[PDB]
């Protein structure tokens, strides 16, 4: 149960939604919807397709970095032993990410407006 990130649009990919494609080099691509899957089939570069988050972040249209809360997210390959106190205060850290990221999201676009 992982909400993966699509290869094309860089958006969320929930269970059931989309397609999984395995290439001969054992590389796994996940496509959220038929639009991104067919665009991948035609081999259109995400950095040259306007409506993709990959293009937006690589074209200066999205934040350079957000070191929000001294840590924002990572693909942790070392599992951590289950604790309630850790699990509850990290539940709170989730939200505290969200308002802070929401605040900086407002500030960045206000800066880009002028």
């Amino acid at each position: 149960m992982r909400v993966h990130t699509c290869y094309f649009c860089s958006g969320p990919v929930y269970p059931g939604h989309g397609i999984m494609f395995v290439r001969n080099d054992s590389k796994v691509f996940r496509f959220c919807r038929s639009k991104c899957h067919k665009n991948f089939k035609m081999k259109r570069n995400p950095r040259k397709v306007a409506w993709t988050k990959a293009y937006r972040k690589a074209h200066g249209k999205e934040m350079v970095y957000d070191t929000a809360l001294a840590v924002t997210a990572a693909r942790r390959n070392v599992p951590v032993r289950y604790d309630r106190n850790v699990i509850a205060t990290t539940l709170n850290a989730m939200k505290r990410v969200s308002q802070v990221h929401a605040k900086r999201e407002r500030l960045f676009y206000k800066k880009r407006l002028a």
Binding site: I19, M20, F21, V22
Partner: peptide, 15 residues
């Protein structure tokens, strides 16, 4: 041919 894995994801190898 794409097939439905019982966990829900659709899979298809390219050959």
């Amino acid at each position: 041919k794409a097939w439905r894995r019982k966990d829900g994801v659709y899979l298809y190898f390219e050959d």
